[PDB]
Amino acid sequence: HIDLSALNPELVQAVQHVVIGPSSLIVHFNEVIGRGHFGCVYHGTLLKIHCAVKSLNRITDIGEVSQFLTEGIIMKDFSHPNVLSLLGICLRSEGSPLVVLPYMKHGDLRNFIRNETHNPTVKDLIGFGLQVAKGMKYLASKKFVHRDLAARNCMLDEKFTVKVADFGLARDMYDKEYYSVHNKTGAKLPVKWMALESLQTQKFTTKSDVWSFGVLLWELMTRGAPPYPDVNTFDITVYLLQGRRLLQPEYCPDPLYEVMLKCWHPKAEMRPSFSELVSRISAIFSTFIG
Numbered sequence: 001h002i003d004l005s006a007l008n009p010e011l012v013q014a015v016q017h018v019v020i021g022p023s024s025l026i027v028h029f030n031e032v033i034g035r036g037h038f039g040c041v042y043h044g045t046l047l048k049i050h051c052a053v054k055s056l057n058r059i060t061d062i063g064e065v066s067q068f069l070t071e072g073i074i075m076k077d078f079s080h081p082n083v084l085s086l087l088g089i090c091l092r093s094e095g096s097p098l099v100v101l102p103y104m105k106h107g108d109l110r111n112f113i114r115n116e117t118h119n120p121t122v123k124d125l126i127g128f129g130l131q132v133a134k135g136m137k138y139l140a141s142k143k144f145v146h147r148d149l150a151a152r153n154c155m156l157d158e159k160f161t162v163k164v165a166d167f168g169l170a171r172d173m174y175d176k177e178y179y180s181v182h183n184k185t186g187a188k189l190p191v192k193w194m195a196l197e198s199l200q201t202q203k204f205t206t207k208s209d210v211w212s213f214g215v216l217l218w219e220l221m222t223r224g225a226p227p228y229p230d231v232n233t234f235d236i237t238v239y240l241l242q243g244r245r246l247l248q249p250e251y252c253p254d255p256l257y258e259v260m261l262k263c264w265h266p267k268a269e270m271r272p273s274f275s276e277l278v279s280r281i282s283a284i285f286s287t288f289i290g
């Protein structure tokens, strides 16, 4: 049940634009197309546009419904070609709401670059990085901190447009291997993507997203290799503090590696902005043919 009185009164108008009438959405529960810790995702058809419908029923309780709606309202206002959009929220009598996302033909960026059937060039891979940078520039301009930027958490549509995903109501752990339980707080953290200061404080900033972006670039240029494989979970802080960074991949251009090292600057405030990353990467990208 939607209680409009409960919402911040300035957001009540926005509710009609986020909520999808059950009549307008058909969900195909017959086959699961995706799995998160919080629930499965299914094909869906919205009024005929193909969408990805995520259930949240694997969570015991959804939380404050007023907050869930507020999250949707905030998320639906985001619009950028390199950011996954929210089409809406559909309310079903039996169970939690369905999250309705655009269908992403080519799945997550990490699996796409790991796939033997596709053969992106070095230029293509740098271009995926640039697209991610533009999406993050947008999110950062909205004062939004992602907290979990990685190749696994970006997706590709049918035109190979890369969209930063896994945020707001689509937030989940979509590959459990890469999340380790903190011993004091119990938080499951993507430690191998995290900045030094975040490993220490568990506080995340746009500048810690910049660190994660550095890692994502490394993933692109290794076509999805796991970072720091011979390091175990929270021993990553000790490893980094020995004076270490991910090594330059064979086909990573030198200036792109220099960008990665700037993304991993020990002082968060000295890391480049996403605007700067877009600028520097666009230049590098422009030097390539094919």
Ligand SMILES: COCCOc1cnc2ccc([C@H](C)c3nnc4c(F)cc(-c5cc(C)no5)cn34)cc2c1
Binding pocket: 033, 034, 035, 041, 052, 054, 084, 101, 102, 103, 104, 105, 106, 107, 108, 111, 152, 153, 154, 155, 164, 165, 166, 167, 170, 174, 175
């Ligand atoms: C090859 O892919 C087959 C098509 O299946 C789809 C298509 N579109 C989707 C759109 C969103 C989603 C969920 C809601 C989602 N939202 N953000 C992310 C995200 F950042 C990553 C993933 C993800 C990673 C992995 C591995 N499996 O799912 C799933 N995500 C799954 C889809 C599955």
